[PDB]
């Protein structure tokens, strides 16, 4: 079944539009490993006892061995840290968003964890988003479509359309198995210079982020995504209230991914939940008690619900 | 040491500005394998003999194995890697630099990344200038992850970048205040091929098309961290088939490095924007790696260029 329905179902299931960001950096690891050594492998032992961990496809042997310190150590903890966050938070998460950048600085080892992370999430049947802000020319971008939607089995991804919209036709649609995928295009990002191009640049008097949205949203039609339970969304920085409001208003019925790590007046979007995914990452994974922080942000959101 | 001085060195040796694009697809690996499982593994054994192949770091015990068929998922890895070496060994004699597009090394998961790693290692030993076409972009400290991967892990000499969401990301990519080192990069200006490439020209500021408005910020950022004196720079990517935009930028700047993908439609009015070569890299990929006799296709393009009026 398509992405829209996977979200539509889960949204009811847990009534929240929270999107947990799983962007583990080096610290979190060097750390998780020690707070784990400097402990009786509490979490790594709770991890090793969740149903789906037994399914991951890569180095399932290593990851499953008793804690005890090989060269697959970094791999060991990196993968288990993610399992832990997911295990500790998935309850409050409508969907998860992993940013490729955090999984690529070590080479293949990082992609192996990533891949397990998605296998684990796919098994837990939780909506996923690879924040990879991909971009490139047609036939080349299909490589990203294969990696993301095929190898990782991801539910969606972020895409930077600056160099074209036709690329969306190679990312969101696959004419070989006739499969349709969802994507999120970078429209506006609260960045002390993101507006240098997304706002100051223009055409027909409308800013650039409005131009790409229109273009993005039109490509969504041409591809027949909606009727195929898929879609193209807009990534709109949380702290971009003015822009976040215009998009929500002028573009109602559209899916919005709001990056950041936290104020909440950001819900300048609303629709019927789900169409305004509020991303929160570091605030939860860098937080000493991930499960707690999660429910906190979980409630604070169900609060701002009405 | 420096990338700017590195190119203006290999510039002399093999006088050329040709840039070979190594973008192995799934059937380049099938073919090469078949052509190998029939000619008693000719090339593979020629690779294995080669000098610097001992400088690759991932799964070296396998890359040097005896052609396997008593393995698992190591087969694909074996041929993918040897095809890239095949090519480099074959044409690295006419190339000014090699451009590896990340997109082609990631669809199989991590295995391709290991292969990409070995390739950057290999080239590093032949001491050939490199470029990673990953077209990266992201906020603040996240890009740090790419700079590490691109420059620390693959020791690449440069990479491509999409600054649409902030020109500042370039400081984060092109500089590293912690190892106090500078890096080079090429930002996408006017990519010709995406016949859907609007935003780049229909989008404008004070009557200046976007690619123009983006080339300046790119340069203004290059001056800030001043890569210049550090033998580094921030260049641009301009499609070969963009003669209008090509002639301009190289005229309205006009000392900025240009990377031009195109031939692999095709033309040659593209050099209608040159200077000391190796500052107008011409990327030819498929036309050289899809060719039956890659060495010649390489020399062919080598002479067609090396032999140009001026």
Automatic annotation (TrEMBL), chain B:
SUPFAM superfamilies, A to Z: Ribulose-phoshate binding barrel
GO biological process entries: 'de novo' pyrimidine nucleobase biosynthetic process; 'de novo' UMP biosynthetic process
Transmembrane segments: none
SMART domains with a match to the protein in the record: OMPdecase
InterPro entries: Aldolase_TIM (IPR013785), OMPdecase_AS (IPR018089), OMPdecase_type-2 (IPR011995), OMPdeCOase_dom (IPR001754), RibuloseP-bd_barrel (IPR011060)
Record-listed UMP 2 binding positions: 23, 101, 133, 135, 192, 285-286
GO molecular function, one term: orotidine-5'-phosphate decarboxylase activity
Catalytic activity: orotidine 5'-phosphate + H(+) = UMP + CO2
Binding site for UMP 1: 23, 99, 101, 135, 138, 142, 192, 285-286
PANTHER family to which the protein is assigned, alphabetical: OROTIDINE 5'-PHOSPHATE DECARBOXYLASE
Similarity remark: Belongs to the OMP decarboxylase family. Type 2 subfamily.
Protein name: Orotidine 5'-phosphate decarboxylase
């Amino acid at each position: 079944m398509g992405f829209k329905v996977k979200l539509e179902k889960r949204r009811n299931a847990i009534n929240t539009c929270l999107c947990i960001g799983l962007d583990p950096d080096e610290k979190d690891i060097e750390n998780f490993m020690k707070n784990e050594k400097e402990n009786n492998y509490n979490n790594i032992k709770k991890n090793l006892k969740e149903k789906y961990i037994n399914n991951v496809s890569i180095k399932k042997d290593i990851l499953l061995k008793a804690p005890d310190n090989k060269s697959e150590e970094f791999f060991y903890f990196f993968n288990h840290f993610c399992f832990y966050i997911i295990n500790e938070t998935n309850k409050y998460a409508l969907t998860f968003k992993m940013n490729f950048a955090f999984y690529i600085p070590y080479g293949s080892v990082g992609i192996d964890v990533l891949k397990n992370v998605f296998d684990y999430l796919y098994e837990l049947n939780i909506p996923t988003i690879l924040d990879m802000k991909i971009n490139d020319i047609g036939n080349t971008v299909k490589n990203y479509r294969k990696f993301i939607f095929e190898y990782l089995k991801s539910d969606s991804c972020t895409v930077n359309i600056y160099m074209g919209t036709n690329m969306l036709k190679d990312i969101c649609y696959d004419e070989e198995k006739n499969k349709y995928y969802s994507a999120f295009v970078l429209v506006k990002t609260t960045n002390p210079d993101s507006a240098i191009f997304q706002k100051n640049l223009s055409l027909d008097n409308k800013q650039a982020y409005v131009i790409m949205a229109q273009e993005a949203l039109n490509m969504s039609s041409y591809l027949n995504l909606e009727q195929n339970n898929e879609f193209i969304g807009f990534v709109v920085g949380a702290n971009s209230y003015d822009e976040m409001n215009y998009i929500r208003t002028y573009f109602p019925n559209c899916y919005i991914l709001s990056p950041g790590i936290g104020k909440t007046l950001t819900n300048g979007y609303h629709k019927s939940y789900e169409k305004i995914l509020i991303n929160i990452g570091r605030a939860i994974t860098k937080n000493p008690y991930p499960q707690k922080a999660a429910q906190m942000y979980y409630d604070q959101i169900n609060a701002i619900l009405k």
